[PDB]
Design a protein around this ligand. Structure first.
Ligand SMILES: *[C@@H]1O[C@H](CO)[C@@H](O[C@@H]2O[C@H](CO)[C@@H](O[C@H]3O[C@H](CO[C@H]4O[C@H](CO)[C@@H](O)[C@H](O)[C@@H]4O)[C@@H](O)[C@H](O[C@H]4O[C@H](CO)[C@@H](O)[C@H](O)[C@@H]4O)[C@@H]3O)[C@H](O)[C@H]2NC(C)=O)[C@H](O)[C@H]1NC(C)=O
Ligand SMILES: *[C@@H]1O[C@H](CO)[C@@H](O[C@@H]2O[C@H](CO)[C@@H](O[C@H]3O[C@H](CO)[C@@H](O)[C@H](O)[C@@H]3O)[C@H](O)[C@H]2NC(C)=O)[C@H](O)[C@H]1NC(C)=O
Ligand SMILES: *[C@@H]1O[C@H](CO)[C@@H](O[C@@H]2O[C@H](CO)[C@@H](O[C@H]3O[C@H](CO)[C@@H](O)[C@H](O)[C@@H]3O)[C@H](O)[C@H]2NC(C)=O)[C@H](O)[C@H]1NC(C)=O
Ligand SMILES: *[C@@H]1O[C@H](CO)[C@@H](O[C@@H]2O[C@H](CO)[C@@H](O[C@H]3O[C@H](CO)[C@@H](O)[C@H](O)[C@@H]3O)[C@H](O)[C@H]2NC(C)=O)[C@H](O)[C@H]1NC(C)=O
Ligand SMILES: *[C@@H]1O[C@H](CO)[C@@H](O[C@@H]2O[C@H](CO)[C@@H](O)[C@H](O)[C@H]2NC(C)=O)[C@H](O)[C@H]1NC(C)=O
Length: 286
């Protein structure tokens, strides 16, 4: 009965979630904070960015730089300005699925910020921290693939978006979408690993160039590969497909970057979802 038209050009929205907790899982919250920095430098408003992060890293007693979170040795503080929509045990299936669906009544804790999107809007979902057919939540119950796909199908039915890009960093990340995500939903998915592979961590203690102050890994290989790609050039000149082929080639030695769902959605430039940093205009992707 509802209308599929609106007088809006289209707003960029994002959901960023680190599914883990504990100081040793520093990498997942750093990844999600680095993605937030990419979005706000691209003009995505805080009001449209839903952040799920346990928030036990920046001021952890073990953190050598309190108030700071970095996602690469010698990198910049990515914790600065990150909204705190769902922190602690408010990062769960109930709140995560209600946020994607956009049901404020289903939210049991947290900010209550959900994807109250409209037909011309674009959604970018990024999850960091997996097993065959499931991805973690800081505490049990975990997020099972069938539940995530039921929510994405309910969201597709509403027609409250033009297109959605879902990036998953986890082991067996592909298993969340393989043979489940129907085409026609306008949802493109990119995963660090296929349904049967584990995913690599990077920026870990061990190499002689690692900072002595840190005892934890700063990032996840696929995440830092695509995040460092987004910071380097004008995202209006690089498509999601061009990023997929770049990261897939760049980390082929570790895992197989896989794509699922509505593949033609990947024809859009990354700026459709992330905007672009006005300081990177004179740097085109070649
Ligand atoms: C998609 O959704 C639309 C919105 O919900 C649907 O519109 C609705 O259509 C139905 C008929 O299919 C209308 O039903 C009743 O309409 C009047 C009431 O109108 C007034 O009150 C409404 C609130 O109750 C307001 O919303 C209206 O603006 C208006 O002020 C009743 O008098 C009717 O009663 C008659 O019919 C019944 C049997 O059906 C008899 O038993 C009664 O005795 C009487 O003869 C209807 O019950 C409804 O008003 C309408 N809503 C609007 C706002 O337009 C639309 O139908 C739907 N499309 C499809 C395909 O399902
Ligand atoms: C800094 O990181 C620490 C390590 O990840 C983290 O320690 C963890 O703290 C939680 C909360 O106290 C402990 O979990 C406990 O949760 C409830 C608390 O009442 C208990 O019922 C449980 O039995 C459980 O023990 C973890 O055990 C603890 N982990 C470790 C390794 O010590 C700190 O909390 C983090 N600090 C900040 C500022 O967030
Ligand atoms: C948004 O989240 C809402 C809360 O989780 C949810 O509302 C709940 O909807 C169910 C039905 O789907 C209702 O459950 C039962 O309620 C009636 C009355 O008691 C019973 O007769 C039925 O058996 C029914 O199953 C809940 O009562 C209802 N809760 C509230 C507070 O309204 C919405 O459905 C969710 N919306 C969407 C679009 O997903
Ligand atoms: C996920 O990526 C895996 C690569 O990391 C991939 O594994 C590879 O799968 C092929 C089969 O498709 C294996 O080859 C098989 O067949 C040859 C003969 O043609 C035999 O000699 C082999 O022993 C084997 O049975 C590759 O060996 C295998 N490589 C590894 C390292 O596992 C998975 O198939 C991918 N999974 C999904 C769900 O796509
Ligand atoms: C792309 O790079 C810079 C980006 O600024 C541009 O070059 C100079 O930019 C400063 C201001 O930032 C101006 O003062 C200069 O006059 C700019 N030069 C020119 C020729 O525009 C420029 O837009 C691009 N550079 C090149 C070499 O094309």
């Amino acid at each position: 009965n509802s209308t599929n038209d609106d007088d809006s050009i289209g707003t960029r929205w994002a959901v960023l979630i680190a599914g883990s907790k504990g100081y040793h899982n520093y990498r997942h919250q750093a990844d999600v904070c680095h993605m937030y920095q990419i979005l706000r430098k691209g003009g995505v408003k805080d009001e449209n960015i839903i952040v799920f992060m346990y928030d036990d890293i920046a001021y952890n007693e073990s953190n050598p730089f309190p108030g700071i979170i970095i996602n690469k040795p010698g990198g910049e503080n990515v914790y600065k300005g990150v909204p705190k929509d769902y922190t602690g045990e408010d990062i769960n299936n109930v709140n995560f699925l209600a946020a994607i669906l956009g049901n404020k009544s289903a939210i049991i804790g947290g900010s209550g910020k959900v994807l109250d999107t409209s037909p011309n809007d674009h959604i970018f979902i990024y999850y960091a921290x997996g097993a065959p057919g499931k991805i973690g939540m800081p505490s049990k119950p975990y997020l099972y693939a069938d539940d995530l796909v039921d929510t994405l199908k309910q969201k597709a039915a509403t027609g409250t978006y033009k297109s959605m890009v879902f990036y998953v960093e986890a082991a067996n990340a592909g298993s969340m979408f393989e043979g489940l995500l129907p085409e026609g939903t306008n949802i493109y998915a990119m995963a660090a690993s296929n349904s049967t592979e584990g995913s690599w961590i990077t920026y870990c203690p061990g190499t002689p160039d690692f900072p002595p102050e840190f005892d934890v890994c700063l990032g996840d290989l696929w995440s830092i590969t695509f995040l460092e790609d987004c910071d380097a050039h004008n995202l209006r000149t690089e498509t999601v497909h061009q990023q997929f082929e770049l990261v897939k080639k760049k980390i082929a030695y570790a895992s197989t970057v896989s794509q699922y769902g509505d593949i033609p959605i990947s024809k859009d430039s990354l700026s459709v979802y992330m905007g672009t940093d006005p300081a990177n205009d004179n740097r085109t992707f070649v």
